[PDB]
Design a protein around this ligand. Structure first.
Ligand code: EAA
Ligand code: EAA
Ligand code: CA
Ligand code: CA
Ligand code: CA
Ligand code: CL
Ligand code: PT
Lengths: 208, 208
């Protein structure tokens, strides 16, 4: 019932794929080559001229956080009540902010910008440590006592940052433990070890 | 029940203010001056070192779209069902994407970047005219038959863009009429005419 339409990269679909995999949901991958994209037709049919495109039956969605929120809603991964739902959003928006900075570094300014980025990184990661500390001493999820779509997105962000700056989580014991804990969830663990995950690059331009 | 903590500018609070005013809600403005921000204490206390900060009872929120979603969820401005909520998110994420570009122009590249931004603008607005075209002929709201938080956000986006690039909606009959229709809603109309809105600059650097 789900289709993911994307480039042959992890990128903005990593988190939503982890979510689907961990939740035992089945989906189709439709792969878009750089050549098809450059041909221009598919791009012109996309609402905002970008991928991912996501189909849930006849419901067609664009925007990676739209897809996360939609799956969060329909799969009960959006907090236990209205207050938790808002906290989940606050976490996801912070994740999205850091993701945009990471995307900027990777695609527009890797060589000149990397040292500065890594130096500023602890400052950008600290709010997630703080959230964890304020929730059951960081022993469960980013919000409340059940997983949310923000957990999968946060997890992705942290995983890609380790690759960017090995040991960056050494300064953050709760985030470190959290990555280990979520990454060990059985369906998730299997997915992250699988060719369909491992054989895709993180980004489209060979940088990580 | 609500408190908005922000600089004396419209910026990222404009949409949530329009929402509150139109929905007959009461709120307190806590105005933060340049001197107070520079002092550092308030900034250090903010989850992501940014304003707005929003209070509603004992709930403290940060991130303008988290605030919009919370108000949307709690006041019933988030579509009629899950499928509509997904479309609402899709519109809001698209509004936010263009807000991000607008902000980057205003704050970091106004004199060099304006000509390229304005030339690109029609292709950036067109998706919203298309959405309107596909929903009851553009006669109601951006999604469905009831107002949503995305409508308030889109209306703001459009109003600030008419200041930036006067006439930018002229080629878009549905958006043009939507702006007039929503702007005529009695409480919103009163708010938009009030000194509280009119006498604040859109941005914090004198550019618009
Ligand atoms: C195929 C490509 C050209 C479109 C390409 O290398 C590329 C550029 C930007 C991208 O994302 C940016 C983002 O905002 O996620 C991604 Cl995921 C890719 Cl694969
Ligand atoms: C505090 C400032 C430095 C003098 C300043 O002017 C400033 C910078 C970025 C901002 O974010 C833009 C947005 O609307 O998100 C805003 Cl709202 C302001 Cl007021
Ligand atoms: Ca986006
Ligand atoms: Ca943000
Ligand atoms: Ca309603
Ligand atoms: Cl952006
Ligand atoms: Pt951005």
């Amino acid at each position: 019932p789900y289709t993911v339409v994307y480039f042959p990269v992890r990128g903005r679909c990593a988190a939503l794929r982890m979510l689907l995999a961990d939740q035992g949901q089945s989906w189709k991958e439709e792969v878009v080559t750089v050549e098809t994209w450059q041909e221009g037709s598919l791009k012109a049919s996309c609402l905002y001229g970008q991928l991912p495109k996501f189909q849930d039956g006849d419901l067609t969605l664009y925007q990676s956080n739209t897809i996360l929120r939609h799956l969060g809603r329909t799969l009960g991964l959006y907090g236990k009540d209205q207050q938790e739902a808002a906290l989940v959003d606050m976490v996801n928006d912070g994740v999205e902010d850091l993701r945009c900075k990471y995307i900027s570094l990777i695609y527009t300014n890797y060589e000149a910008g990397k040292d500065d980025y890594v130096k500023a990184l602890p400052g950008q990661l600290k709010p997630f440590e703080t959230l964890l500390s304020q929730n059951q001493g960081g022993k469960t999820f980013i919000v409340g006592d059940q997983i949310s779509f923000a957990d999968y997105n946060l997890l992705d962000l942290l995983l890609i940052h380790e690759v960017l700056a090995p040991g960056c989580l050494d300064a953050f014991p709760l985030l470190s433990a959290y990555v280990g804990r979520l990454s060990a969830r059985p369906k998730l663990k299997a997915f992250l070890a699988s060719p369909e995950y491992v054989n895709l690059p993180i980004n489209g331009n060979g940088k990580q």
